């Protein structure tokens, strides 16, 4: 399994066992991202959301093919450390998944 | 399909077992839809978890 | 079939017999069933029409203690594609089985475009 956020807390990764990458802009996250995703192996991916807020969107054509690869969004260390409410993200996913969008 | 009566009696029964199929998956989309509203709250509740 | 009938029985030829059309004769029959006030059948065709279908059919065949043979080929078209009319019913009742062509199959380019499954 792999990561890909800040080089701070990529290394911290590395040391947990996964192999980390250090980014701060979204197109070098894609295409190593991308990079990754070609050849066989470890199925799990993990971003910041800084970096990549869709990990489907990148990979859309690849994902077609092939439902099995995992690709999950994650909270970054400044987003971590500013905090924020998590509301969002499912009320987003409700609308993603059946499309009313309303979720009280 | 020849007009005759055994073809009517047929097609009704077609008929027939079509509204049973479609009241049929009603009920088995509701079923998914009282799964989906619970495994939605695990998947908030597990996302604040992973946050501290 | 009067003369297919010598042939075969008299010289002990062995013949084939084709028919173009018997939704013309069925036709020409029910001209005359109409002038005449006949109880209709199905869709206006006349009561005896098996009869009369009958005695044209039946005189295919083979005779013991003699040589020759009759083959019968009958051809016709099925209205509306429809088994269910009546002259192609009352030809299956007689007959001794029937190959059915597929308008499908046609479609496709496949010739001949005989359906095994009717």
Do not use: W
Request: proline share 6%.
């Amino acid at each position: 399994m792999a990561v890909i956020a800040d080089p701070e807390t990529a290394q911290g990764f590395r040391l947990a066992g996964l192999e980390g990458y250090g980014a701060s802009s979204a197109e070098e996250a894609q295409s190593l991202l991308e990079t990754l995703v070609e050849r066989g192996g470890y199925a799990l991916v993990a971003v910041d959301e800084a970096l990549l807020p869709d990990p489907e969107r990148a990979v859309e054509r690849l994902m077609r093919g092939r439902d099995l690869p995992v690709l999950l969004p994650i909270a970054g260390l400044k987003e971590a450390f500013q905090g924020h409410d998590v509301e969002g993200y499912m009320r987003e996913l409700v609308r993603k998944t059946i499309g009313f969008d309303i979720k009280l | 399909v020849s007009p005759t009566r055994m073809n009517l009696l047929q097609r009704r029964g077609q008929l027939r077992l079509a509204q049973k199929g479609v009241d049929l998956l009603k009920k088995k989309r509701d079923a998914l839809v009282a799964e989906f509203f619970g495994l939605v709250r695990e998947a908030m509740e597990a996302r604040k978890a992973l946050d501290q | 079939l009067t003369v297919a009938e010598y042939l075969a029985f008299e010289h002990d030829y062995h013949v084939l017999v084709i028919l173009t059309d018997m939704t013309n004769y069925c036709e020409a029959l029910r001209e005359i069933g109409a002038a005449r006030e006949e109880i209709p059948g199905r869709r206006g065709y006349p009561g005896y029409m098996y009869t009369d279908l009958a005695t044209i059919y039946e005189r295919a065949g083979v005779v013991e203690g003699k040589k020759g043979s009759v083959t019968q080929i009958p051809i016709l078209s099925m209205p509306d594609d429809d088994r269910t009319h009546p002259i192609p019913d009352l030809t299956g009742y007689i007959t001794e089985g029937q190959i059915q062509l597929s308008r499908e199959l046609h479609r496709k380019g496949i010739y001949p475009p005989i359906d095994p499954l009717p």
